[PDB]
Structure formats: C-alpha cells, structure tokens
Write a protein that binds this ligand. Sequence first.
Ligand code: HEM
Ligand code: HEM
Ligand SMILES: CCCCCCCN1CCC[C@H]1C(=O)N[C@@H](Cc1ccccc1)C(=O)O
Ligand SMILES: CCCCCCCN1CCC[C@H]1C(=O)N[C@@H](Cc1ccccc1)C(=O)O
Ligand SMILES: C=Cc1ccccc1
Ligand SMILES: C=Cc1ccccc1
Lengths: 455, 455
Amino acid sequence: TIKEMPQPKTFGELKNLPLLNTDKPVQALMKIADELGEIFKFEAPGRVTRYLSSQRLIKEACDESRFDKNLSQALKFVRDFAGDGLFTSWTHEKNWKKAHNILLPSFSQQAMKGYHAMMVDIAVQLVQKWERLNADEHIEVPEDMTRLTLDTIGLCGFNYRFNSFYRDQPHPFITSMVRALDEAMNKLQRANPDDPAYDENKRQFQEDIKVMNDLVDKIIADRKASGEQSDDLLTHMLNGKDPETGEPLDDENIRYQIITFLIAGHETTSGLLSFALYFLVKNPHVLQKAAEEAARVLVDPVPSYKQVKQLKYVGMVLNEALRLWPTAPAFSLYAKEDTVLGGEYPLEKGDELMVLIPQLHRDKTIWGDDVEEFRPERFENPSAIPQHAFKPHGNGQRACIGQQFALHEATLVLGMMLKHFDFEDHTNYELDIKETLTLKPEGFVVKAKSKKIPL
Amino acid sequence: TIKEMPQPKTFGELKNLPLLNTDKPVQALMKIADELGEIFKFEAPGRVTRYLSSQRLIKEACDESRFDKNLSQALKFVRDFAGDGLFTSWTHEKNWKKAHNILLPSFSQQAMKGYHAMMVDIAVQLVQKWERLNADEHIEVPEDMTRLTLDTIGLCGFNYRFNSFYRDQPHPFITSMVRALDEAMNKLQRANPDDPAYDENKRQFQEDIKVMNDLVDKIIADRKASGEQSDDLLTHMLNGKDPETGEPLDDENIRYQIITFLIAGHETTSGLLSFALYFLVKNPHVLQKAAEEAARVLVDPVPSYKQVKQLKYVGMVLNEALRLWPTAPAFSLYAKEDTVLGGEYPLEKGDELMVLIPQLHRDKTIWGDDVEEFRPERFENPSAIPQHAFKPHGNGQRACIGQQFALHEATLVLGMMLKHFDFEDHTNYELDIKETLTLKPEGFVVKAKSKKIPL
Ligand code: HEM
Ligand code: HEM
Ligand SMILES: CCCCCCCN1CCC[C@H]1C(=O)N[C@@H](Cc1ccccc1)C(=O)O
Ligand SMILES: CCCCCCCN1CCC[C@H]1C(=O)N[C@@H](Cc1ccccc1)C(=O)O
Ligand SMILES: C=Cc1ccccc1
Ligand SMILES: C=Cc1ccccc1
C-alpha cells in the first residue's frame, strides 16, 4: 500500500522554498502540517525533505539502526561558526564520538552536584533583581531568562561571568549570536545566496562571528593563565582523554565546543523558562500547585542539590511546557539504507526527514482531546506514554547531552521564582513566538509581588 | 589704607568674560588666584564680582551679620529646574526657612541611624559588582561612584530604587542632569545667550529638565500609592510642619526639593569618593593606614552604624580629599550693608563675593608649606583647624544640610572598598578634573584585587 504524500504549494523553479520567506517559518510549517497531515514533501532547488508530524511515523524515524542524525540546512549554516562541535558534527566524523566520550562525564550526577552552587549564584542574582523593582515596574521575561541562562552556562561551564544582570542591554555575545541566528534563519529561503544583494549580510555575519570568537579567546586565555584549580566543562575540554582514540580534543575543536555550549547551553533553556512562566500565569491552578511544592521543599534560604531533585511537580511543569513549545523545534534525519516508513512511504538510502516536534507533541492519538491544555499531570507516569511521543531533546546517541543541566537549572530557578514571588499577567499577554531557529516568547511581561522571604 | 584690587586680563568690551570660555573654569580661576593673590576683581558686561582666596578675607565674608548667601550666575541657571528648593532659594524667601525647619530633622543622628541599613544595601551591591569582575577587567571609578551615590539618596531619601548597578549605561536621570549642569556651566561664558547658535542647547536643556521632572513624578506617585509606611526624607517633605509658620511644604516646592536632593544629595559625594580613591592609589603609605583601619574595625560582614563611626582615619582621608578638591568648589555672598573687607576693600550694599574654596584650602599661612601634599594626618586633631579655614560644606545657616549624610555614606563605602579589595593604578592615571559646576575626576580607572572576604 504505497501512498503518495501531499506537498504544499509550489512556486515554479523555487519549489516550496518561498514558504520559508517569513519570520515564523516553524509556525508556518505547523499550519501546513495541520492541513496536509502526518507527512508532507518539501522541496527546494537541489533538495528534498519530508516533514513528519505523527508519533506513528516518528517512532520509526527514531530507529537508530535505520536513521542517523542529518544536518538540516539550518545546522549547515550554523556550522559556519560552530564547526564540528557536538551539535553540528556528523555522527561519522571522528570528532563527534571523541568529544562525546570526553564531555559525557561533564553531565554526570557528580558533575551536576558540582555545578549547583554556581547555578544558585546566578539564580539569586535573578531573585534580587526582581526584589529590587519598584512598584508597578514589570519584568521583561525572555530578556531576564536569557540573562540568567547565559550567565549560568558561562559560570558553571567556564568560570566566566558575563555579568548579564549588570547590563540593561544584552551582552555583546547575545547581540551577535541572535544576529548570526537571524542570518541563518533568513538564509534558508534565499534562492541565490551569492547574489551581491547579500554582501552586507555576509560582512555582518563574519563580524558577528569574530565577536563570538573573541569572547571564546578570552575564556580560554583566562583559564590557562588562571591560578584557581577548576573542575568544570572547560577543564574536561582541555584535559579529558577519549577512552577509544586515547586523544584529547585539539585546540580548533575546543573552540567550536565552547561556542557550541555557550549557544546551546543557554538559548533553549531561556525559551523553556519563558514558556513555563507564561503557561503558569495563564493557569493559576497549576501555578499554585507548583508554588505549594516550592514552599514545602525549599525550606532553606539557599536551595540544595538534593532539594531541587525533590521538585518533581516543577519538573512536570517544565516537561509540559516543552511539550507545547519545544524550544529547539525540529531535528533532521537521513535513511541509513533503503527502508519503508509506516508501511506506506518507501525511502532510499540518504533520503532526509524533518521531525516537526511541536506538531508531534500535538498528536491527538497520543495525548487525547485536551491536547492544547497545559496539564503537567500528563507526565506523572512515563510508562503510560507511548515510545517516542515526546522528543524535545532529540533522539538516541545524538540526543541533547545537556538535558540534565537544563532541567536542573530550570527546576532550581522556577522553584525559587515560585518560592519568592506571586506573579500577575497584568497585560493579559497575547502569546507571540519569535523564531531564531529556536523558539521564545516575544514581549512577554509580568508583575511580581514579593512574598518577602529572605535569601 | 584703601587698596586697589588686581584684575586678570581683559578682552575689550567683553571685559573678563572670555576667561570662562573653557571646559575647566574653576581651575582657570584657581590659576588666576595663584597669580593675583587673595582677592581679584572679575568683570563681565553688566556684572562685577570679587574672588576671595585667603582665610583672612573669607572669615570676614563668613560673618553672617555682614554677608548673606548670594545666587551666583551658576545657581541662577540651575534654579531653572531647582526653583526655590533649599540650594537655590534666597535666605529671605519664605520657602527657605520653612523648608529648612521642616527638613533639618531628616538629618538628625536618629535619622542617620535609620538610613544606615539602606546605605549598606547599595554599598554591598557595589562590592558584589567588583567581586564579580573577570580577570584583568577594570573599574570606571566616577561612573560606579555615581551609581552608588544616586542609588543611596534615592533609597534612603525616597524609598525608590534607581537600580543603577543593573545598567551598563548611566541612568537616564544622570545623563540629563549631567547635560543640564554642562549647559549651565557653558551658559556662564556666553556673551550673547540669544544667538541662534544656542537654540538647540536651549531645546536640549528643556528636554533634560523634563526627564528630571518625569522621574520626580514617578517618585511622588510611588509614595502616594505605597501602602507600606515609611519615615524618610520624602515623608518629612509630604507631612512635616514648619513650627514657625505652622505650614507644610506645598506641592510645587516639594517637587523642587526632590530634584534638589536627588542632585545635591549624590553628585558631590560621587566626586568625593572618586577623588579619595585617586589620592589613595597615588599615596600608598596613606592607603596602607586607611586599609589597616578598615580591616580592623569592620569585623562583621555587614558594617554597623557604630563601626562606621570608628573609621576615624578613613574620615580624615575624606576630609583631606575635600581640602584639595572640594567638589562644590565655590559659594557666593552679597554685602548686606556697606562694609569694609579686610580693612582695605570698601564694599557697597549688594556687592557680590565669590569664595574660591580650593584656594582657601591651599592658604599656606593656615596649612603650612606642604599644601599640595595629600596628608590626612592634618585632620588628626580637629580643634587644631582655625575657624573658616576648611569650608567644603559652605557657611552658617546656609551650610550643607546633608554634610553628615555624605560623610557617613562616604566613610562606610570607602571603608568597605578598602576592606574587600587591594587597588592598582594600572594606567598610572593622570588626574583630569571634569567640571560640571561640580568637580570630578574624568577617566579614572583602577584594577581591584579581591581579598576574598565574604559578605
Ligand atoms: C530545554 C533546553 C534544551 C533543549 C530543548 C535542547 C534540545 C536539544 C535537541 C532537540 C538536540 C538535538 C538536535 C539535533 O538532533 O539536531 C540537542 C542537542 C544538543 N544539546 Fe541540547 N537542549 C537544551 C539545553 C541544552 C543545554 C543546556 C546544553 C549544554 C549544556 C545543550 C547541549 C546540547 C548539545 C551539545 C547537543 C548536541 C549533542 C550531540 O549530538 O552530541 N542543550 N539539544
Ligand atoms: C561631599 C559632598 C557634599 C559637598 C562637598 C557639599 C557642599 C555643599 C556646599 C558648599 C553648600 C553651600 C552652597 C552655597 O552656599 O551656595 C551645600 C548646600 C547644600 N547641600 Fe551639600 N554638599 C555635599 C553633600 C550633600 C548631600 C549628600 C546633600 C543631601 C543629602 C546635600 C544637600 C545640600 C543642600 C540641601 C544644600 C542647601 C542648604 C541650604 O542652603 O539650606 N549636600 N552643600
Ligand atoms: C538550532 C536548534 C534548532 C534547529 C531547527 C532547524 C529547523 N528549521 C528552523 C527554521 C525552519 C526549520 C526547518 O524546517 N528547517 C529546514 C528548512 C529547509 C527545508 C528544506 C529545504 C531547505 C530548507 C532546514 O533547515 O533544512
Ligand atoms: C552646584 C554647586 C557648585 C556651584 C559652583 C559655582 C562656581 N562656578 C562654577 C564655574 C565657575 C564658577 C564661578 O566662578 N561662577 C561664576 C561665574 C561668573 C562670575 C562673574 C561674572 C559672570 C560669571 C558665577 O556663576 O557667577
Ligand atoms: C541551539 C543550539 C545551537 C548550537 C550551535 C549553534 C547554534 C545553535
Ligand atoms: C550640588 C548641588 C546642586 C543642587 C541643586 C541643583 C544643582 C546642584
């Protein structure tokens, strides 16, 4: 029963490419999935992929014996500054497994215990900023979540203080990074990228790349000249040895990994925290339950590692926010051999797939009628959730290496936010999702009322 | 008997006015005093004044039966936004004595004790900022001292948080205030203030005035809507009764007092702290003595009121810094009746005098030959200082109402800085004194090496 899959509207020789000519391409692709269903073909000059939206098909795509990670066009563009770091390397490149082996211990339990104190440092800075607001001033949520998450990966990972809460404007790094990611998103729809109309884009792209690399140099210079014995992500990067090849990372790859972890280690966690707070103020009953947990668990002025591990309802709040709005909204795969998807769609070796995560997470056959509802209780029993229904961290050996880092940081920070403040959606904010490859609310503001609980 | 005053060089019908056509007019008058001596006449079209530099003549000018406070042209210009607040009112205006009676209690010892905790709040924010700098970053001294001092008067005086340490740029109030003070100083030398060349200056001046008043609006509304009860400077402004008239201040005068205290309550203290640190890093023997005291007295993570009172040598450092560079560097007087100054200079009722405080403080007949040297030991025994020899806070009933506030804040903060850091003049900074009517080092930077003492 070989089916022919739908395809959205075409534009002559540009095929489907102009459908990406929007500032919200992921949301546009979601609307297409709404209309075409669980699978549709998407073509551009010289390229074809297939967008998957159903758990029925995505569970087969997650078979690592059949499909391996593919670099989407977006990741190929980001590779211009992230190189063969963990996020933008092919599984078969030597530096993928080597860096994976070397950096996996930087996310062990004992590693997370070692990061905890510095995570608290930044979280306390966030709480103090908010305690110090005047009456009827408000919080710019994504902006402050980005301050927090960038500073956390800088300090925990590299012993470097971006000091984001000492800045009313974003750190230079953030400004360049957002611009580079803007350029990568926008370059996706360009039919003729070498047209001189984009000479300035190219110049600015390089400019933003040197800005990011300059900071990387500074981080590296300080560490090697330092006199403080550190044991963090940068330590493993400079000293760890791959058990297989016996080799450490070389300097070029280390630079790529730092860029990778500074970007990947904060941007999606700030999106997650922003969406979580959004859903909490829109669902006060859920906020209360989570606040009750926070008050009962966080009985000391400074949260401990053990206490964060007990914020289990906060944990399902974050998972439910990742279900509705997974902040890294897609990943790509290619067929390792000829194979047939779902018994209907044959693929040849090398054929590409796009996993459209926000649409997967809206599969009504999995989650039921109330799929648009924010109900953290959905996550009470992982054994009741079918395989590969929930993929906000990717799949298999190419899944998110920093998943536990993000969840620990976000659980800690949200727990402290709910311990220390009541929140008001004073503008009745209308959710507006900005796309920079990743997803984040734009213009989300709230008011906090202090519970006046000492730190 | 009757002597003729010297006068500096003239410019035809502009008389002496072009001598003020400089970005550093106080320093120019200072050099003129060095050439001409204890008194010189200064003429501009339509105006004459006499600049006094010796303690011999200044002690007579400080006789309140013979001379009263005059509004210099500088203060007349600043009155365009400070009105009949305490700094820019005539002694004979009803609102001077009324506001003085109402607000003096805000600066009593019991009020000082009540401001202390908030002063520590901002000081701790300063220390934490510097603790969090990375390897070989540096401190912009006048910029951070202005962050501290504005936030201190805002919090202590008005329970309002400017949150200047959350801004990498100057607070908008500071930008507009600096520009208005700049305009007021530059306006002093304009022979034709109505030349169209100044139309933009006037436009900008009005705009900076509005920025300043908008912030005043926020402070008043913040207080009026505040269900929390306070007992600070703004409380007395809004509720205190003058025992003489029995009246409280009216709304118009309240606005002028708030602008007056926001400016006069921080600008000159930022200058003092900046000059003090400058002299400390240029005089390591003195820095050592001051740091010894700070380390010995401030034995607790949170300094107490009593401990700040014990920082005697830190206090002498501050007074010696006020001796060399009094940051409000002049005040003006007029003759109440015909009188003879110093047995030699006849004055008519209404004749004006300018007290050049930096020159007073260099009178070798008072201080000895070493007047240019930074020697806090001069202040060891305060009864050794002759009357009217040391006047950084003005004179008599028109003296600085905030003297004790400024010295307590500055002693606390300088004490904490010396407790928590070693300082390095890593650029061998060359003193450059920016003039905005008030005086402050420009471009002064240092490196701080934490002593790693917990807060
Ligand atoms: C909620 C926050 C986060 C989300 C939703 C997220 C999501 C993902 C996803 C979906 C992938 C797979 C990408 C693909 O298949 O092309 C991935 C990979 C990765 N993530 Fe995360 N991530 C998060 C936080 C972090 C953090 C904090 C770090 C760093 C500490 C991190 C480091 C990485 C790295 C290095 C990879 C590449 C892993 C490999 O292939 O070896 N992520 N992430
Ligand atoms: C080291 C810092 C300071 C210096 C050097 C200083 C200096 C002076 C001087 C010289 C005068 C007399 C001006 C004249 O005769 O025209 C004065 C007046 C005044 N100062 Fe200060 N001052 C300082 C700090 C402060 C602070 C912190 C406040 C507010 C808390 C303040 C509030 C005032 C007020 C209100 C007046 C006018 C007093 C009146 O005439 O009733 N000053 N100051
Ligand atoms: C950085 C973490 C998130 C990355 C998610 C990237 C996911 N894209 C972010 C923007 C849209 C979405 C996507 O569908 N992209 C495709 C677009 C494409 C398909 C076919 C031909 C040409 C180009 C791609 O990049 O190949
Ligand atoms: C705000 C607290 C500090 C005030 C310091 C003021 C002190 N001036 C600050 C800059 C110079 C100095 C001063 O000598 N000014 C005179 C100028 C003047 C004199 C005679 C004729 C025309 C103009 C004045 O303003 O009258
Ligand atoms: C979100 C992850 C990421 C990783 C590398 C470059 C750009 C983005
Ligand atoms: C330095 C004190 C002051 C006071 C009012 C206006 C401008 C300056």
